[PDB]
Tab-separated table of C-alpha atoms in Angstrom:
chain	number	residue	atom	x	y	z
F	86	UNK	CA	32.726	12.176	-70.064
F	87	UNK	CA	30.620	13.903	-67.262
F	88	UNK	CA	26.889	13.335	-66.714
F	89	UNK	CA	24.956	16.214	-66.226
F	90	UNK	CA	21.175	16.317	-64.993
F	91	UNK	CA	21.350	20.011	-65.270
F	92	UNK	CA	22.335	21.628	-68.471
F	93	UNK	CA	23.875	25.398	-68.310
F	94	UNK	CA	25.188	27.945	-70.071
F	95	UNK	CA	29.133	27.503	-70.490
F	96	UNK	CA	29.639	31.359	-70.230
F	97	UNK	CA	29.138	33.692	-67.421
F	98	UNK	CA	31.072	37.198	-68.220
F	99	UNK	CA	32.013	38.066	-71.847
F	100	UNK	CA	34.887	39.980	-73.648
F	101	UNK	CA	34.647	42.995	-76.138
F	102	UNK	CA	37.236	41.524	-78.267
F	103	UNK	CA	40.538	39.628	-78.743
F	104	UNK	CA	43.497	40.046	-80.918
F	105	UNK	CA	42.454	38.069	-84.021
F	106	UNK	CA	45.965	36.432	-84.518
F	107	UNK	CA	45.942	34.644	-81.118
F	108	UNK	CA	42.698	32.741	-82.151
F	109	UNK	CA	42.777	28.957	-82.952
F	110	UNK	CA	38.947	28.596	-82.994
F	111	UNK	CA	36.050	29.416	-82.146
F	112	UNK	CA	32.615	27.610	-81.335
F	113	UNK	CA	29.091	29.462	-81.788
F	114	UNK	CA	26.404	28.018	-80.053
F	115	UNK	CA	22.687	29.059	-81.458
F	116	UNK	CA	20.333	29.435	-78.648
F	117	UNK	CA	18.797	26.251	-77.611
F	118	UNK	CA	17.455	23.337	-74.997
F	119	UNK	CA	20.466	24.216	-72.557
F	120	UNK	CA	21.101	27.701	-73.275
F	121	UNK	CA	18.963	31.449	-73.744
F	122	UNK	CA	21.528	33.532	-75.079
F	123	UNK	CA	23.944	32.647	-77.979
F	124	UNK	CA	27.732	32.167	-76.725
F	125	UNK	CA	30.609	32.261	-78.484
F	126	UNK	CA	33.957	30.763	-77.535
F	127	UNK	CA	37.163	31.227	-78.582
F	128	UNK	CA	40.121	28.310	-78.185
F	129	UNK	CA	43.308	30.038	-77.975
F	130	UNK	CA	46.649	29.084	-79.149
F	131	UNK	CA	47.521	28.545	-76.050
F	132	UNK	CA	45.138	25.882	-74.996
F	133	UNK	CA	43.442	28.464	-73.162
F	134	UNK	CA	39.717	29.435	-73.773
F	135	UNK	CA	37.694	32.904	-73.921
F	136	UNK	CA	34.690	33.921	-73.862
F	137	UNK	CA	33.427	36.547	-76.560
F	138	UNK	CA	30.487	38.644	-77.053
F	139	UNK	CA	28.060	37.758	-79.802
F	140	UNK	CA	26.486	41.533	-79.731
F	141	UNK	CA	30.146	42.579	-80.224
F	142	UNK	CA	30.669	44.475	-83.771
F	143	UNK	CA	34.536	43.131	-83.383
F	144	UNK	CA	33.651	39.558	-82.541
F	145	UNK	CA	30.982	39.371	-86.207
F	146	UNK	CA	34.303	40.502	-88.366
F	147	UNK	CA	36.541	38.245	-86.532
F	148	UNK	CA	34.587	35.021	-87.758
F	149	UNK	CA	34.734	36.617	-90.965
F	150	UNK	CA	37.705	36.793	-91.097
F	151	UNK	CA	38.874	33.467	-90.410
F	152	UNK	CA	36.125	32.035	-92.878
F	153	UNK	CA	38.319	33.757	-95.668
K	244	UNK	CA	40.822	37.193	-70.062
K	245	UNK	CA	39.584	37.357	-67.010
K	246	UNK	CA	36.362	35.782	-68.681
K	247	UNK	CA	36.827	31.792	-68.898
K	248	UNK	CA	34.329	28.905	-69.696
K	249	UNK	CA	32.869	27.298	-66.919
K	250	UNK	CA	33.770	23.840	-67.097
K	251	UNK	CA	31.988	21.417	-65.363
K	252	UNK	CA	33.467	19.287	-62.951
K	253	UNK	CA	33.067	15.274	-62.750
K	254	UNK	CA	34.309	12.837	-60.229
K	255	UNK	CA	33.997	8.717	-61.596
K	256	UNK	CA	33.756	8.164	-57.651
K	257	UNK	CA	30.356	9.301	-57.609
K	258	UNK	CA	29.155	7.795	-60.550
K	259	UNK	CA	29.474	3.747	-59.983
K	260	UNK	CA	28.526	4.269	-56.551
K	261	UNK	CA	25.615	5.684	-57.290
K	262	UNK	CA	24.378	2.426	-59.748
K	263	UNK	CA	24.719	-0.264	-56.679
K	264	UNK	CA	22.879	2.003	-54.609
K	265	UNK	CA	19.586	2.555	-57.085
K	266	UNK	CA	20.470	-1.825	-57.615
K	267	UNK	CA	20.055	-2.174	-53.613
K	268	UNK	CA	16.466	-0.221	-53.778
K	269	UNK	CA	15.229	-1.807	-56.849
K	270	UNK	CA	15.480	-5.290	-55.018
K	271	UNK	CA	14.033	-3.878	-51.813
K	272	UNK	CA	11.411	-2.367	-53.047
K	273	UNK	CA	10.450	-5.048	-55.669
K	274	UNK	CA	10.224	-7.332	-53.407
K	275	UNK	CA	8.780	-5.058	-50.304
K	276	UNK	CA	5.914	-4.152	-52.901
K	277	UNK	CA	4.848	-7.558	-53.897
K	278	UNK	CA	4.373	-8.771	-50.413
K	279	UNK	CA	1.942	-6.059	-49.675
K	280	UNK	CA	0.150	-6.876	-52.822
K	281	UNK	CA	0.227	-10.493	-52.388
K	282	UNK	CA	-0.865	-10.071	-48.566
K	283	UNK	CA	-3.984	-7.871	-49.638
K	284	UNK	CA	-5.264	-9.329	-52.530
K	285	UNK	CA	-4.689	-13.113	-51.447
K	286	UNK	CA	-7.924	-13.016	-49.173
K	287	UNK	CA	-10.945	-10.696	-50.302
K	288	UNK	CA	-12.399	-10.601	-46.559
K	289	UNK	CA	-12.306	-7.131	-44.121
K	290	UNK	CA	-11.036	-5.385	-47.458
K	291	UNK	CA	-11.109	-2.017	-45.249
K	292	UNK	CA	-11.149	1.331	-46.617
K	293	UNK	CA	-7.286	1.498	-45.875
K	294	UNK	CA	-6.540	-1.463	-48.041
K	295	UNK	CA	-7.337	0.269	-51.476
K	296	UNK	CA	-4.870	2.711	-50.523
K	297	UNK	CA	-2.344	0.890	-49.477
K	298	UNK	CA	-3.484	-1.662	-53.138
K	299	UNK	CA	-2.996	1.503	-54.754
K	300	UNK	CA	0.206	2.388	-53.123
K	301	UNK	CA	2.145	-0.564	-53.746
K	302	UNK	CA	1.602	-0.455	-57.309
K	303	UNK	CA	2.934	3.262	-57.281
K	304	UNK	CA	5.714	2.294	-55.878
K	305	UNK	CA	6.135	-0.396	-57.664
K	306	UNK	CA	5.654	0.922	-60.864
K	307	UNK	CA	8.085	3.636	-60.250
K	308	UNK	CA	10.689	1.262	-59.117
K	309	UNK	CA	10.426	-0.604	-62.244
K	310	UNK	CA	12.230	2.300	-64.276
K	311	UNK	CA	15.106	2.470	-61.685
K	312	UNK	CA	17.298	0.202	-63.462
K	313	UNK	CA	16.984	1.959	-66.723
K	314	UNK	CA	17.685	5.888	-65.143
K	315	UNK	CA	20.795	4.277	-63.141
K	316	UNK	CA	22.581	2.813	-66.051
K	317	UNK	CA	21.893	6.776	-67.682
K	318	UNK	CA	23.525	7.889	-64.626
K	319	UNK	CA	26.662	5.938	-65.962
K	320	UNK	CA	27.028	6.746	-69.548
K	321	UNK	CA	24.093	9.139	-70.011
K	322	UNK	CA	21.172	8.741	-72.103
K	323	UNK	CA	22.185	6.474	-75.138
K	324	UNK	CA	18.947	4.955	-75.001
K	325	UNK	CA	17.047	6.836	-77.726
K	326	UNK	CA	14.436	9.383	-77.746
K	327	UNK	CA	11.466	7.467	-77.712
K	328	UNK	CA	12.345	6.073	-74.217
K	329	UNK	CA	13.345	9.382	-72.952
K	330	UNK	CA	9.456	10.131	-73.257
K	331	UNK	CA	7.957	6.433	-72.129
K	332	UNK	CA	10.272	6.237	-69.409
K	333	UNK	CA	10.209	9.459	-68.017
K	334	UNK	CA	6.402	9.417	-68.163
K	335	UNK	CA	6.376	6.467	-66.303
K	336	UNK	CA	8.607	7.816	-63.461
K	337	UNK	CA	6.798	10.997	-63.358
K	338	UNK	CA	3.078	9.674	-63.409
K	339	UNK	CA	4.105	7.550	-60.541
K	340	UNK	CA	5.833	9.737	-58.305
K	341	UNK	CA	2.826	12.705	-58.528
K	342	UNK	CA	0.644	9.245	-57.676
K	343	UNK	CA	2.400	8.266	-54.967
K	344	UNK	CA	2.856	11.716	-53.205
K	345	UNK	CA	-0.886	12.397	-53.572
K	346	UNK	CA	-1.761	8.977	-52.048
K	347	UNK	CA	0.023	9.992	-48.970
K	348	UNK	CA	-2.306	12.863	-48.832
K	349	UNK	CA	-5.600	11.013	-49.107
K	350	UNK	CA	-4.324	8.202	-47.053
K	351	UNK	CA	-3.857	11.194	-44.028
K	352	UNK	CA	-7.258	13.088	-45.094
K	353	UNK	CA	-8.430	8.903	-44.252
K	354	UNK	CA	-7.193	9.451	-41.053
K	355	UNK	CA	-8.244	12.433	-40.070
K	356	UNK	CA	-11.708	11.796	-40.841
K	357	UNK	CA	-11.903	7.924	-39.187
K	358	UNK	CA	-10.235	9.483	-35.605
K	359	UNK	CA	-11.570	13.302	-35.540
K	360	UNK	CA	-15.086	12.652	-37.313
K	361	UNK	CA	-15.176	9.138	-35.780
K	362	UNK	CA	-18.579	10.251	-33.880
K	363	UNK	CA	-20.164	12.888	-36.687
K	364	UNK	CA	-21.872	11.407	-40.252
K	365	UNK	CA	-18.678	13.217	-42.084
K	366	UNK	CA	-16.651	10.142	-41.864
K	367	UNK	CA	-19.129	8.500	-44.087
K	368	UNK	CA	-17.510	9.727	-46.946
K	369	UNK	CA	-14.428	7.491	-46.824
K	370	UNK	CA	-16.170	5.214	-48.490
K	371	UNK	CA	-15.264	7.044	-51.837
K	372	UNK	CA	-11.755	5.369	-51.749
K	373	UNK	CA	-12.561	3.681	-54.725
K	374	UNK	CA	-13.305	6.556	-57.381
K	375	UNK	CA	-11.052	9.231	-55.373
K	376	UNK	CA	-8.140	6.679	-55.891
K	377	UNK	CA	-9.307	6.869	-59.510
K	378	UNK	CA	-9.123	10.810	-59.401
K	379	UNK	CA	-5.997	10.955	-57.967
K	380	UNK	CA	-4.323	8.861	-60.886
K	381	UNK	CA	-6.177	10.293	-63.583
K	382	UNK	CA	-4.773	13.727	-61.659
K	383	UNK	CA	-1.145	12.629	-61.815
K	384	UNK	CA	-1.416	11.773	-65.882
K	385	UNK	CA	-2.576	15.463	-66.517
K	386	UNK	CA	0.526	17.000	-64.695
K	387	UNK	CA	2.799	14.441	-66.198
K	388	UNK	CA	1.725	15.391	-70.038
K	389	UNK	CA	4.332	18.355	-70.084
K	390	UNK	CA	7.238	15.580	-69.449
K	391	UNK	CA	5.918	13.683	-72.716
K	392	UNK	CA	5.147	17.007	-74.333
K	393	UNK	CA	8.422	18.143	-74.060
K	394	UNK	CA	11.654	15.740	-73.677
K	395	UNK	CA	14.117	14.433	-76.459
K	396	UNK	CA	17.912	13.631	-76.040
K	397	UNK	CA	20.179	16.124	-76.201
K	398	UNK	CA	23.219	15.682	-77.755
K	399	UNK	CA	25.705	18.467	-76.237
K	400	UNK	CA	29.962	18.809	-76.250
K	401	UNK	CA	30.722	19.160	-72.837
K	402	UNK	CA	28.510	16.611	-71.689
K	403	UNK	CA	26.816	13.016	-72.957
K	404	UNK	CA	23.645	13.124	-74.056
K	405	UNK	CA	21.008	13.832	-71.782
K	406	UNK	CA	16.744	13.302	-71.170
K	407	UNK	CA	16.573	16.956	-71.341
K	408	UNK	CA	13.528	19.427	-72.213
K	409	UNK	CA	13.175	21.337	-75.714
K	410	UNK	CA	10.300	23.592	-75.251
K	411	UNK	CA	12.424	26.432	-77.928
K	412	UNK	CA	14.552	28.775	-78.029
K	413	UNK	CA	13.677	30.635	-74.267
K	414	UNK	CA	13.828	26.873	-72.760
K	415	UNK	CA	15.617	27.703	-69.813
K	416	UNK	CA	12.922	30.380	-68.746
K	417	UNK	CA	10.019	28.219	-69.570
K	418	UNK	CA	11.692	25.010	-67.925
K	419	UNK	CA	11.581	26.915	-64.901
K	420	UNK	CA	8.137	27.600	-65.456
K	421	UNK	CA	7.122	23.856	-65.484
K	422	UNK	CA	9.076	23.120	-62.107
K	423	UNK	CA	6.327	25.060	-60.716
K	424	UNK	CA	4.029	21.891	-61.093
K	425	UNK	CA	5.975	19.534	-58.771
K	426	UNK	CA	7.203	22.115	-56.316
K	427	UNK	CA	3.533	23.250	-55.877
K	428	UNK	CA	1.226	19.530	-56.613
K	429	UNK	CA	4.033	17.667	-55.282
K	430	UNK	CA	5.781	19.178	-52.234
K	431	UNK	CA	3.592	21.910	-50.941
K	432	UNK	CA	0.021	20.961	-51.677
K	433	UNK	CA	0.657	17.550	-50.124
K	434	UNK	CA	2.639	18.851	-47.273
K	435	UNK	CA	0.024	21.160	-46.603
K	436	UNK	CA	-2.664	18.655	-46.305
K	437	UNK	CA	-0.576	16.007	-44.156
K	438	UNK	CA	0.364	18.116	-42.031
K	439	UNK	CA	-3.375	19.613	-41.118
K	440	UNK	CA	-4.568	16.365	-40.981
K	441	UNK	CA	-2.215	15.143	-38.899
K	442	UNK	CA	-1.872	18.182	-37.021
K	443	UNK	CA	-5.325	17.765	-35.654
K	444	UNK	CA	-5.903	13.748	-35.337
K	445	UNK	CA	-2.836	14.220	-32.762
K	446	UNK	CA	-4.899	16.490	-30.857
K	447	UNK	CA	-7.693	14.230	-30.757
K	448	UNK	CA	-5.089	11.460	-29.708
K	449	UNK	CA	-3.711	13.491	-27.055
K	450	UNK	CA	-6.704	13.633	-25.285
K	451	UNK	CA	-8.369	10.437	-25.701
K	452	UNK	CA	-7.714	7.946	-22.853
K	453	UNK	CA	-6.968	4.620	-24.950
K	454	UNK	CA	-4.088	2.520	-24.283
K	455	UNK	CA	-2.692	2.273	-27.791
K	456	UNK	CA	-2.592	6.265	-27.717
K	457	UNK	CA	1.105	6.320	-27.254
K	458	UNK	CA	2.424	3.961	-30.464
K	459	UNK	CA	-0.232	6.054	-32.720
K	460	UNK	CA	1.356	9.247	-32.071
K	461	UNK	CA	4.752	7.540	-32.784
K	462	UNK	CA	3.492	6.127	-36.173
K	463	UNK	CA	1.950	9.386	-36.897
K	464	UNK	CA	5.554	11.370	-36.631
K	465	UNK	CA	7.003	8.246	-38.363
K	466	UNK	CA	5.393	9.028	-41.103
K	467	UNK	CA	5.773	13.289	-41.124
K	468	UNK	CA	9.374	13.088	-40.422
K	469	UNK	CA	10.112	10.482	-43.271
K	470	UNK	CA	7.935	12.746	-45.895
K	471	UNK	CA	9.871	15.472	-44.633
K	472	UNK	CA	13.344	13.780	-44.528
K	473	UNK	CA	12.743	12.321	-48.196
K	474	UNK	CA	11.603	14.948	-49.925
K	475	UNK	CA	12.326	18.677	-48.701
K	476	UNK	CA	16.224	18.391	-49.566
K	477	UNK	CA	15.678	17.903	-52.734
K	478	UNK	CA	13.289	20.793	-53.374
K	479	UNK	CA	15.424	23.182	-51.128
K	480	UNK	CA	18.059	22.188	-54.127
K	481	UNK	CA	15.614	22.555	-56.779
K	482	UNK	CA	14.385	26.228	-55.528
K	483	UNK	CA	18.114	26.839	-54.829
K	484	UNK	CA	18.961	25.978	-58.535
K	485	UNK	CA	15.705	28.904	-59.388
K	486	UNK	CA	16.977	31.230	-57.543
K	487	UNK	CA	20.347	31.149	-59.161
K	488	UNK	CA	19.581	30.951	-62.835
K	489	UNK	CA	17.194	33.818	-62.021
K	490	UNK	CA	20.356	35.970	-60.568
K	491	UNK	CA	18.473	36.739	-57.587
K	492	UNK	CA	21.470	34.783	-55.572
K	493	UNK	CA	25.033	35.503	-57.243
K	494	UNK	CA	26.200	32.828	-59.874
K	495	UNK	CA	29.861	31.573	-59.886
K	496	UNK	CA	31.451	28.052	-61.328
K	497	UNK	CA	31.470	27.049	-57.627
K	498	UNK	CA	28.501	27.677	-56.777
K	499	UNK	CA	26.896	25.789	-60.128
K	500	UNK	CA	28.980	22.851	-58.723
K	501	UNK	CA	28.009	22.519	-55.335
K	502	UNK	CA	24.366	22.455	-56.715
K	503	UNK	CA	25.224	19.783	-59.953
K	504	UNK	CA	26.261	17.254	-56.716
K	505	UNK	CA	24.253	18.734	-54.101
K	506	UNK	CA	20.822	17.272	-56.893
K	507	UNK	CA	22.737	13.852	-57.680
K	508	UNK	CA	22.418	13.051	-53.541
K	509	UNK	CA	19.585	14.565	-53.251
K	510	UNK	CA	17.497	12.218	-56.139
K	511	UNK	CA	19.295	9.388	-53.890
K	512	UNK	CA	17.780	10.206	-51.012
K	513	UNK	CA	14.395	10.394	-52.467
K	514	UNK	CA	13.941	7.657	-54.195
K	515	UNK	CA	13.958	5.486	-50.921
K	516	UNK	CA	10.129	6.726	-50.660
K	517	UNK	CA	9.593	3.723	-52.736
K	518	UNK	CA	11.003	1.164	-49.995
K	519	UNK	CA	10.097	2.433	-46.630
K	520	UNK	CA	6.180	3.002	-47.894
K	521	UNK	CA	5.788	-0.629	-47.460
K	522	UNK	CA	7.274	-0.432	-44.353
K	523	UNK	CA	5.912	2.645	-42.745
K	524	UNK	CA	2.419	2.622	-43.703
K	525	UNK	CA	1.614	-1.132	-44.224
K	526	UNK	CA	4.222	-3.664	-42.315
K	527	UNK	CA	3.415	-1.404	-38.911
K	528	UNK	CA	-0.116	-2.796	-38.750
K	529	UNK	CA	-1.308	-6.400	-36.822
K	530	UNK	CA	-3.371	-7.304	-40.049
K	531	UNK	CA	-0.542	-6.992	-42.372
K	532	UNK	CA	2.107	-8.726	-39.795
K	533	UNK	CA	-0.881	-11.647	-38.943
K	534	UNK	CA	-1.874	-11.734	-42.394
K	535	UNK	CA	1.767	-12.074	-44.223
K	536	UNK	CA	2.120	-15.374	-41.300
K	537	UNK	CA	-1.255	-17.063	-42.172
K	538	UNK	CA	-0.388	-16.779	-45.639
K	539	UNK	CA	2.972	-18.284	-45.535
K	540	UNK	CA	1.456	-21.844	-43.701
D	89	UNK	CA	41.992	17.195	-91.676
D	90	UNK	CA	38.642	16.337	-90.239
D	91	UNK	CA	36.898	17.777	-92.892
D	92	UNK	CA	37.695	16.172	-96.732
D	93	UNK	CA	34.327	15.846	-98.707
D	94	UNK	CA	32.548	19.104	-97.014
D	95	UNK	CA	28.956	19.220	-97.571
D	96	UNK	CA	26.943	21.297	-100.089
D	97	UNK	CA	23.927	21.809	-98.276
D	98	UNK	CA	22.679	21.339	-94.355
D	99	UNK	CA	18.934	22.251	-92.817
D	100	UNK	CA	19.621	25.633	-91.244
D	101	UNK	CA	17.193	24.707	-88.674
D	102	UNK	CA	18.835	21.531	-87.834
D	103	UNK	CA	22.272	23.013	-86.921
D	104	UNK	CA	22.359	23.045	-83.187
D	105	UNK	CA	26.172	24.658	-82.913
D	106	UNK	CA	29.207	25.367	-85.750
D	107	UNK	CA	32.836	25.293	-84.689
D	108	UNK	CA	35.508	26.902	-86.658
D	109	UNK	CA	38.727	25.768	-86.801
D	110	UNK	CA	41.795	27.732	-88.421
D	111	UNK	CA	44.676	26.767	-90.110
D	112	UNK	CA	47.185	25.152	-87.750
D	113	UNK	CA	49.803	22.150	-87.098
D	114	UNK	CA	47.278	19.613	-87.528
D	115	UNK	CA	45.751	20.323	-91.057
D	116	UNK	CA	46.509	23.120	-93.535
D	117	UNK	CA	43.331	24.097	-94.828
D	118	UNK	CA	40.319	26.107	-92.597
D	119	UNK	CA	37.460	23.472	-91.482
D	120	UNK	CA	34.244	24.594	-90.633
D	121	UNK	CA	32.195	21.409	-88.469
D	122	UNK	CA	29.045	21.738	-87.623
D	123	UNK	CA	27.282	19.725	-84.866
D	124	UNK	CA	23.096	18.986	-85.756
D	125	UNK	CA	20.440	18.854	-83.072
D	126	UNK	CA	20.940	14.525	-83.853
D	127	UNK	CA	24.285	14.227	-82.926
D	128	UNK	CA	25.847	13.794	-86.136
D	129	UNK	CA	28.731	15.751	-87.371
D	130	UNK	CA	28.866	17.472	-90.968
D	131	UNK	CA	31.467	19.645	-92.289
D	132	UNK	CA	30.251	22.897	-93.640
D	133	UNK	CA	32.385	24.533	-97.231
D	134	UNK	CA	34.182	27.644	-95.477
D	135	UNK	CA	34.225	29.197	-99.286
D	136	UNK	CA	30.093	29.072	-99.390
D	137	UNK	CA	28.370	32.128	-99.490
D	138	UNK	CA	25.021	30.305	-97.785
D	139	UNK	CA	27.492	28.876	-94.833
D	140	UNK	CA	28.572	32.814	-94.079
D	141	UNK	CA	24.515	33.523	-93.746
D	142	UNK	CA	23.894	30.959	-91.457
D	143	UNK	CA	27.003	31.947	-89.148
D	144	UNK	CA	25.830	35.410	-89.565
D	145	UNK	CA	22.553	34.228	-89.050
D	146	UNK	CA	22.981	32.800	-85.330
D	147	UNK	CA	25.035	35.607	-84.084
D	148	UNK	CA	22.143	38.059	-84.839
D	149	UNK	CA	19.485	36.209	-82.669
């Protein structure tokens, strides 16, 4: 894989939302070493990915509701 | 979705490439190093002022090159070393580089005070070489404690694991913080005081009447212009990088790849301090050149 | 599925990043993977109550 002697955020603008039956995943990311905000990303079915906005109210149900 | 992830970018081209080239320094400067050492400290007479510097030099340099072949093969794979070398290791780089940029500084406050002062009772107190040498390494441990303080492998997704910082959860502000330390002890402090003293010892020069006037001036931009050369691309990158996390200059994926490979040739180019210093400061001297023939018989 | 003996407990503080996977071609049952600050991988119960808190948790911040 690459080799990095920087580490960065993987998100630069974010989305209010995304129509929950499009979404094959998604990845939180606590803050941490290589990263000051949280970030969540969403894998599409498409292959594509998405950024999404933890502060969101939408994007907080939308894990829920996967996790049923 | 106009919002994507950013994903980084990697060529393999630029990775293998890079391990021959730290290989080719590690010989050179193994091997530079030990001949200045073994020229030095193989005869005890005329140990000048000058010689404890350069003594102190070598094994700098030589120190620092010693942990070249370990951070090339991270280049390659990353970090699968373990944590407790990504603190040793990077200690020993670190300790060694603030060592040898701050030698370069006393070597030229030397100078300035054997060819300005030559006359006056000031240049009496060169003969401090031995504790200020001291100072100056005890000096480079203190600045080199956040480095052990603060550096673990971090295992990421995207990337291999990495000698990275974990100072908590607001680590990319504080980071930034601690870069202070070797753009200000390390780049502008020493620049500073090179560049006075050699500012005015090649006033002095260009008004004596000697006849070896003309290759001291030479030597003396030698020496500025391969500082400068080494050393102020890769903190023009570094303040770049700054800038940009601190949105004062606009952030796109581009632009956060030009600087990922922009730092990678950069750390190149700087890590040749450790094989012209032999050559520059000690190899340009008769008593090094005579010496290194003697000794040979 | 990646996930068959899911885990009954995991360090909160440990858990650098959780991914979520849904149903799909590739395994019929929701996984829930999460990635600690060591490198290893440990797969989280989707159905636990605790493993909503700590999702819920991290979003928060």
């Amino acid at each position: 894989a690459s080799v990095a002697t920087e580490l960065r955020c993987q998100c630069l603008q974010t989305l209010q939302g995304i129509h929950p039956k499009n979404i094959q995943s998604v990845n939180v990311k606590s803050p941490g070493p290589h990263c000051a905000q949280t970030e969540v990303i969403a894998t599409l079915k498409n292959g594509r990915k998405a950024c999404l906005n933890p502060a969101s109210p939408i994007v907080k149900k939308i894990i829920e509701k996967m996790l049923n | 979705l106009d919002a994507a992830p950013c994903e980084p970018e990697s060529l393999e081209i630029n990775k293998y490439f890079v391990v021959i080239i730290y290989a080719l320094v590690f010989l050179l400067s193994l091997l530079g190093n030990s001949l200045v050492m073994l020229v030095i400290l193989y005869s005890r007479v005329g140990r000048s002022v000058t010689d404890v510097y350069l003594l102190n030099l070598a094994l700098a340099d030589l120190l620092f090159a010693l942990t070249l072949p370990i951070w090339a093969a991270s280049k390659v794979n990353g970090w699968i070393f373990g944590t407790f070398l990504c603190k040793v290791v990077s200690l020993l780089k670190e300790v060694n580089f603030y060592s040898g940029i701050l030698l370069l500084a006393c070597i030229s406050v030397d100078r300035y005070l054997a060819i300005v002062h030559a006359t006056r009772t000031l240049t009496q107190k060169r003969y401090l070489v031995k504790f200020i040498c001291l100072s100056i390494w005890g000096l480079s441990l203190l600045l080199a404690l956040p480095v052990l303080l603060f550096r673990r492998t971090v295992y990421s997704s995207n990337v291999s694991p990495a000698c990275y910082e974990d100072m908590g959860n607001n680590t990319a502000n504080w980071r930034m913080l601690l870069r202070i330390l070797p753009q200000s002890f390390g780049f502008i402090v020493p620049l500073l005081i090179m560049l006075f003293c050699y500012g005015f010892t090649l006033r002095t020069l260009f008004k004596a009447h000697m006849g070896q006037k003309h290759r001291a001036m030479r030597v003396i931009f030698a020496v500025v212009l391969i500082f400068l050369l080494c050393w102020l691309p890769y903190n023009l990158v570094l303040l770049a990088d700054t800038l940009m996390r601190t949105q004062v200059i606009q952030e796109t994926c581009e632009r956060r790849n030009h600087i990922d490979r922009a730092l990678d040739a950069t750390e190149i180019l700087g890590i040749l301090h450790s094989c012209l210093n032999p050559l520059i400061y000690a190899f340009i001297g008769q008593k090094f050149r005579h010496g290194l023939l003697k000794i040979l018989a």
